[PDB]
Ligand SMILES: [Cl-]
């Protein structure tokens with residue numbers, strides 16, 4: 001529950017490492033399925049899960065992007 | 081009855097994938113160059129690619145998404161000192 005202290009310079013360095021990671025992963029991200037579960041779009045695709053089926057560092061970018069798609073596209077479209 | 085536009089799965093997926101490719105392209109240009117902590121939440125700042133009048137553009141959306149993701153994940157790990 002407790003967090004670690006960090007300074008501005010070190011935090012920005014790690015933040016920028018995350019951005020570069022996301023940029024890398026995004027080249028492989030593709031929505032391959034969508035349903036509308038109750039007025040909410042849910043996009044599906046390859047989450048880059050590990051061999052045991054668990055999310056990886058790489059998966060985080062997929063969850064973020066698919067949530068963004070649901071959030072934005074659900075406001076303008078309904079699936080027929 | 082509704083206020084969204086109807087769309088089929090094929091067209092919807094094409095549109096979602098274009099958004100993904102667009103975010104991919106913009107991310108090449110994204111860098112967090114500032115951070116503060118406000119009411120316990122980290123706030124990252126940098127170039128939002130605002131238009132000449134200071135308003136968000138389509139390109140800006142990728143930055144807002146990425147910086148929110150950073151605030152959400154890093155605030156749970158760290159606090160700024
Ligand atoms: Cl309809």
Ligand code: NA
Nearest residue numbers: 155156158159
């Ligand atoms: Na925190």
